[PDB]
Structure formats: structure tokens, C-alpha cells
Amino acid sequence: KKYAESLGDESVIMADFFTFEELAGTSVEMQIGLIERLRNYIFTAILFN
Amino acid sequence: MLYTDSLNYKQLSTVSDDMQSYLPVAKEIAKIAQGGHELDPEDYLLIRDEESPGVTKKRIEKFAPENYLGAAIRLQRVLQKSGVLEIKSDSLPGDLTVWESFFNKVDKRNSSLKDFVIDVFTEALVNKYCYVQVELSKLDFDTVTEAEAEGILSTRKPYYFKIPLQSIMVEKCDGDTIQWIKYKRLDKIDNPFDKTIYNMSYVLIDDQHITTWTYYDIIVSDSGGISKIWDQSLNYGKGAYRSIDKEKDKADPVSFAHNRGSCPVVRYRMDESLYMADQVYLAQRMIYGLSMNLFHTAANAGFVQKWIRPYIPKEALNEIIKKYAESLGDESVIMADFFTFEELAGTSVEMQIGLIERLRNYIFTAILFNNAKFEQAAKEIDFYVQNLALKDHGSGIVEFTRSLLHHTAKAFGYDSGGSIVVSGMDRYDVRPIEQVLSLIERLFKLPQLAIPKDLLIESMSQLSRLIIENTTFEYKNTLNDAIISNIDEYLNSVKKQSND
Amino acid sequence: MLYTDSLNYKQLSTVSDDMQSYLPVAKEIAKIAQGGHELDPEDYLLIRDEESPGVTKKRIEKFAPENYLGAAIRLQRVLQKSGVLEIKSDSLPGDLTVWESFFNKVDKRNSSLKDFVIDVFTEALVNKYCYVQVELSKLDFDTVTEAEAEGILSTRKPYYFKIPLQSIMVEKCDGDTIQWIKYKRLDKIDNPFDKTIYNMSYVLIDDQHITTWTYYDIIVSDSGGISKIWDQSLNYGKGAYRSIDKEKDKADPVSFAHNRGSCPVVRYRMDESLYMADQVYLAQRMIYGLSMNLFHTAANAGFVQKWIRPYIPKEALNEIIKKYAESLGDESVIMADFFTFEELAGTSVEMQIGLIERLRNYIFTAILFNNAKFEQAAKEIDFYVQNLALKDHGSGIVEFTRSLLHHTAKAFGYDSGGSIVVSGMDRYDVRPIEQVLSLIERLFKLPQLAIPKDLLIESMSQLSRLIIENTTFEYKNTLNDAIISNIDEYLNSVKKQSND
């Protein structure tokens, strides 16, 4: 409870490890590339870029 | 045809099945595209399955709608407005003077023909089936003779009226021609010193008759219909608002024959392959939700946290952390064991940014257009793109100025006349003087016998008003009169030279 | 129509439902767009759900509003001002001299017609429905005969007046034409040696009559209405301020017929698809909040902290840290065990910067414009973009100079006349001399019989005043007179050559 209350710029917390865990993101761009290649095939079915 | 029977509210309020199916999706698409303050964030929440309402409202507070669909609609409207629309006068049946008088003001909004047609096109662009009706003014007199009837027939002044799509209730139409149509119209009687009153009219336009059923002093319901109506007999005869009866509250029709010979409505229907709003509105609401979630995540993970590991009793620990906080600046060396500045790296935020960017790219590629023009000789194309919207606003400004000048002339006691022609606000271009000079030179290089004096006068006047600006209207008038006289003399001289 | 009955404050103060719904959002959008000192940081706080007020005020101290919406409005106004607006004199009904006299000063703000229309366009751009009224001056005399009435009718001098949108209370209008309108007007009677007094007027403009209800010596309320009014009978007859009565405090109407035949107001209504302020104001307030939070985070995490690990008793530790602090510079070698310089890396700050940048990019892409022009032959386009605002300020400067010269002429006892035409401040361009030379050459290459002497005189005078500057007005006048005489001689010579 205390930790949550004092978790901002206006406080120095007294914890032991407080990493900000975040998704790196490599699969999202993988699926984006897959969708992009499907769209590229759709637009190359006609001879267009 | 001629209707003379009062109808219950249920009969008037009927809506055909196809309209019942189509109106909700049209309303949704219009709401998505228009955006603005009418948007309700609640409807565009990607909530994690009913979490605490406090965090929901905190997330709602960060609602920043990016209506890229609205930008695309604006771009298409401006691009189409950049075109030219012309009417061949000789092909107009009947007197040309009455046609010009009508074209001075084609509708109650004072817009010109091209402006009105572009507005119709825009309304169809946001949602198809834009309906326009052509009507007249009403004049009624008693003890009418044949001459009075002739005058009434000869005093018709038509104008256009755009029927809202959501107000359409039913219509019988084959192809594009409309056999007949019944729509609704909520007209507000505004009292300068009292609460606004509302009336509800159901208008049926037929082949040779037009009829209206009117309910007076009603209350509009959340479904767009009637909820409560006034009743003078109520309140022991004083009158009050009572619930609408679907079988006993009947409206007496008022009908008359327009003698048009056909239904005086026209529907503009954008082709399905061209109607892009049907295929991007879902992407737009997805953008709304994703942007809200992205801003919420960034705000909740944007701060920088600084933790310590004290250097060596809860009271002693409290004393230590107090001391540490006090001496945590540039003017002190702390004695701690580990004081990293913990901060979010940020890879998910840019991931969501990329997702929103790809949604926007799809929205702008639904039309064959590239948004990279505004993402990061040559720039003259972008300048012309700006000039397109400049020309649109200039046309609107010219219309407003014409109306203002008409009112001003009426203020002097003059009866107007010629509607005070106003030009300009149509050619926005860098370095415009030499373009007009080139136009003048190219005109003069043409066979002089083939150039009317009016064209030369117009071009020279444009040059004169471009070269000197911020000057008194008297000075410009004097210069234009001198130009006109000199051009007339030159034309007469060249004519007499050519004759002999 | 003719009103002659006093009305209670409740009757005057009524506002139509549509206006009641629309005024708050218009006020909010106007406040967001205008920005400036009127902004209240409290309203744009992304506070972490009611934390300590001390940190809230510390965050408020770091409020630096970046009104990109204001920049976009300025850009659109300047771009539209870059256009040309022209009036065809021959189409003006009635005498042309009175039209020119009116066009010398179209409103009480001394702006020209184009300047006034651009101001109206800007007011509509920030918030739609800009209202303009056309009125006259009032003259009253006693023992009036027919000749006196004729003179009073002939001495009308109309001018324009922009009605603030927030002052609109109710209006009945079909399409763009306004049937009638009631608005409010708070007029301050300023006393050079006393407290400012306030009066409240409710103005109803009708088809053929205009009426005003006036409450004298009132106090404006926080809602824009009346809170307290003066009462001479109060204070035992000495008078005092007492609360307004909504049923007993009645204002006597004063009305007169303007004989315009129609309501002398015009509303400019920017099209919804073109009105961009409705779709970016939320983004602008989000920018305000995000910028405040970003600066607060940067300030609270911007310092560099330096910690130690002492090399080997709390008193002994105090002695050690004192010594360490003393010997922490370039001129000493410390004996510690670990002395890293702890510093914020910074990845979240640039994340928030990117978020604010993308919000600004959306704001600037609501209009089809690219902000990269001011983010990082060719540059001549940017120079012309600057020249646009230069031309706007130049038009304002020319208006001010005309007014100043009019007052100066009045100082000499001269009665003005021609209003002292002033030109210039309209062509800002790099290397302007050869542009004027090219204009002169192109004019002279045209058929000389087709060029009036006035145009040549104007162009040559422009060249003369460009080639020599910082010179006495006498020198420029002498050069211009010589040019005029020489041009007249040349034109006469070529005319007599062409005659025979």
C-alpha cells in the first residue's frame, strides 16, 4: 500500500528492485510484415506497386 | 395524390424495413466521420473487461480523438471543389434573365450552384443518398380573379432544400428517379421571450401532390419521434403535456398540388466502389480506442522513479529515508548503496504508435492517396494543395461578401440590382504579378480581331488591382476607368485600321 | 414589430435551447484556441487522482502552453488574407461616390472591406456563426418639418458591427437568412474620475423594427447576466445595490423602425467539413496537460546525483561524509570505494516528447498542411510564406497610417479630402528592384495605344520610390512630378504619331 502511494516523481521509494517491465515487441512487427506481404500480393495481382 | 383523412401517429411514424435497416449504420458512420464534441468516449473504450470505474473515468479523461477520416473527407471535398462547373446559357429553356436571377441565390443558404452541388457531394460522401427538394414560396389571397391567379402563377421563386438522411422515413423509387417519398421534419418555433416550442411534420411528396401532417407543441423523444404532446383540455382545461397516443392522436393533413408533373426531389447516390466511408469508419473508431489506451498507458508509465538502498529498526529506517529525500540534489553527495534512476525504456508505446500509424495509413490508402505528403517546382505541389482549400474558403467568403454588400446597399435605401458582382479570392499563387503579366501578354499576342474588349478590360483590371493594394477604393476606381477608356480607344483604333 | 410593454428580467434573459446547448462548447473551443494568459492551468491537469496540493501547485508552476491550434488558426487566416478581393464598381447601385466614401471606413475599427471580411472569416474559423449587423448614426431634432425629415433621411452613414457569438441569446433563421434575432450587449459607461458603471442592453432585431431593453447601473454576474442593480430609493433614498428581481425589475423598451425591409444582420457559417477547430481542441488541451506533466517530470528527474561508498559509529560516518564533500573536486583525489555519478538516462522524456509531437502533427494535418516546413527557388516558398504575414501586417499598418494622416491633416486645419490614399507594405520580396524593372519593361512592350498613362505613372512611381529610399519627401515628390510630366509628353507624342 505504502509503495503504491509513493510511486511518482515527487517521492524516493525505498524498495530493492523496481524495474519498469515492458513488452519489447518483435512479434507485433512480424505480424505487421505478414499482413504487409499479403497486401503486397493483393496489389501485385494486378501489375501495380 | 389528394389525402384528406386524419391519420394516427402510428400511421405517420411508420418506416420501411430497408430504411429501418440502413439508418442505424448511416448514423454510426456519420458520427464516426464528423467527430468533434459529439463523440462520446464511453462508446470507444477497449476496457479490460469491466475494471474499476475510477480507472475507466481516468482513461476517459485522456480522450483525444484523431479524426483522420474527417481529414480524408475534407481532402476529398476540397479536391473536388478545385474543379470547374459551368452551365451553357444558350441551352437553358425559357427566359435567361429569370435563370440568372435564380442562380444569384440557388438556396436559402445563399450558396451558388457550384457551392450547393459540392455541399451535396460532401453530404453523400460522408453518407450516401443525399436528397434535395425543389420548392417555391407560398402566397395566399382571397377574392381571387383570373388575373390574380395568373400573377400568383407568375410569381414563383424556386429554391433547393437538402433533406437530412436520418429524416427520411420511406420512399418508392425506381433506379434513381423517385416516385414518391415521405420524410419527417422537426421545426422549432422560437419565442424571443419564452421557451422554444417544437412541431413535428410528416411530409409526403407525390407525383402531383405534396401533403403535410403536423403535430403542434410536441416533445421530441430520444428515438427522434414524439414523446409528449400539448393538450389544452388537460390541467382542468388549462392545458399540459400528456403522453402521445398511437391510435387516438390524429393529425389533419394539409395538401396542395405543385403541378410539377413529377416528384420534385433528386437523390445523389455515390457509387459503392467510390463510397470509402463504409470501409474505414471501423478503423477510425479503432483509432479512437487505441489512442485512448495509448495515452492512458503513457501517462501511467511516463514518470521517473528513483529508489535507494540505505547504507548501514523501522524508526531508524524512517529517519534514514527522510534524510535521504532532503539531501537528494546537485548540492549534496548522498551516502547510499544504490540510487539508480529507474525509467521506462519505451518499446510498447512506439509499438502502439506504429499500430495507430498503420491504421491511419490504411484510412488514407482507402482513397488512392499517400499521407507521406504531410508526414516528413517540387513544394509548389503542396502549395497548390493548400491553395485548393484556400479557394474553397474564398468562394464562401465571396458569397458572404455579396450578401453583406446587398444588405449594405439596402441600408443606403438602394434597391440592389445586379446583386453586386464580386470576384477574387480564387487565385492563390506565389508571385502572382508576373503570372497576370504573362496572361496579359499572351492575350495581346493573339489575333487582335478575335479578342473582345471585355476580356482585355477584365485582365487589365485584375492586373491593376493586384499591383496596387491597400489603396482607397477611389484610387482603384480611377485606375480602372482609365484602363477601360484606353482599352476602348485601342480597340476602336485597331478596328478602324483593319476596316481600311 | 413594435414593442411597448416593459418586460421582467426573466423574459429578457431567456435563451433558446439550441443556443443553450451550443454556447458552452463554443466558449470552450474559443478558450482553447485563443490560449494566452486567459488559460487556467487548473482546468488542464492530468493529476494522479488528487495527490497533495503542494505537488499540484509545483506542477502548475511549470505550465507552458504550446497553442499549436492558435498557430494553425493564424496560418489559415494569413493564407486566406494572401488572396485578392475585388468589387466591380459599375455593379454598385446608386451613386458611386457614396459607395467610395463608405468603403473608406467600413466599420468603427477603421479596417477596409477586405480586412473586415477576413476578420469575420477568422472569427468564424475559431468558432462558426460569425454575426454582423449593419446600422446607421442617430440624429434627433425638434420642430421637424418635411425638409428636416428629408435631410435626416439623406444623412445616413452605415457601418458594420461584429456581434460576439457568446452574446447571442436567440434567433429565428431559415437557412442562412435571419428572420429575427435577440442578443445581449454589456456597455460600460466610463467615468474619467469615478468607478466604471455598467449597463445591460437586450437588443431584438426584427424584420422592420429594432428594440432595446436597458437595465442601468447593474453588476455583471459570473454567468454573464445581471446580479445586482442600482436602486436610488434604497439606502433610505440615497440608493444602493440590491439583488435583481426576475419578476418585478422591468425594463422599458425603446424601439424604432429601420425601414430596411429585412433583418439587417448577416451570419457567416463555415461549413462543418471545413471547420477544423471542432476536431483538434481536445488534442490541444491534451497537449497542455502532457506538456505540464513532461516538464514536471523533467524538473523532478533532471538533476545529477553523486553517491559514495565510504572506505574503511554514526559520528565517525558523519565525519567521513563531511570530509568527502569537502574534497570532491578536480583539485583532490578522494579515497572512497565507489563514487559513480548517477544520472537519468532519459527514454521516457523523449517518449512524451514524441507523443506531444504526434498530437501536434495531428493538429496540423487536420488541415492538409505539413509542419515539417518549420521542423527541419526552394526556400523562396518559405520566404513567400513569411511574406504572407508581412502583407497582412502591412495592410493593418496602411490602415493605421491612413488614420494618422487624416488626424494630422485635421491638425493643420485642413478638412481632409480623398482620405489621403496610401499604398505600399504589400509586396515583400527579395531583390525587388529588378522585379519592378521587369514589370516596367513588360508594360512598355505592350501595344502603347492600349496602356493608359495612369498605369505607367503608377509603375514608374513605384520604381522611383524603390530606387531611392531614406530621402526627403521633397526629393521623391520632385522625382515623381518629373516622371509624370515625361510620361505625359511621351504618351502625347505617341498619340499624335498614331493619329497621322
Numbering used by the authors:
A (entry chain B): 341 to 389
B (entry chain C), C (entry chain D): 1 to 312, 332 to 395, 404 to 527
Paper text:
A-1(L) is a Myoviridae cyanophage isolated in 1970s9 that specifically infects the model cyanobacterium Anabaena sp. PCC 7120. Using cryo-electron microscopy (cryo-EM), we solved the structure of A-1(L) tail machine, which consists of three parts: a 205-Å-long neck, a 1045-Å-long contractile tail with a complicated baseplate, and six pairs of tail fibers. The dodecameric gp2 portal, the pentadecameric gp5 and the hexameric gp7 sequentially constitute the neck of A-1(L), to which five neck fibers are attached. The long and contractile tail of A-1(L) contains 24 rings of gp10 hexamers that form the tube, surrounded by the sheath of 24 helically stacked gp9 hexamers.
Twelve gp2 subunits form a dodecameric portal with a central channel of 25 Å in diameter at the narrowest tunnel loop. Notably, we observed two extra densities: one in the central channel and one around the wing of portal dodecamer, which were assigned to two segments of the dsDNA genome in our model, respectively. The dodecameric portal is surrounded by five major capsid gp4 hexamers in a 12:5 symmetry-mismatch pattern. The wing domain (residues Met1-Tyr275) of portal interacts with the A domain (residues Ser178-Asn282, Leu353-Gln365) and P domain (residues Asn22-Arg177, Leu283-Asp352) of corresponding major capsid subunit, forming a circular cleft that accommodates a segment of the genomic dsDNA. The dodecameric portal/gp2 forms a channel for the passage of genomic DNA, whereas the hexameric neck/gp7 provides an interface for the docking of tail. At the 5-fold vertex of A-1(L) capsid, the 12-fold portal/gp2 dodecamer, the 15-fold neck/gp5 pentadecamer, and the 6-fold neck/gp7 hexamer are sequentially interlocked to form a symmetry-mismatched neck. The dodecameric portal/gp2, gp5 pentadecamer and gp7 hexamer form a symmetry-mismatched neck, which are perfectly accommodated to the 5-fold vertex of icosahedral capsid.
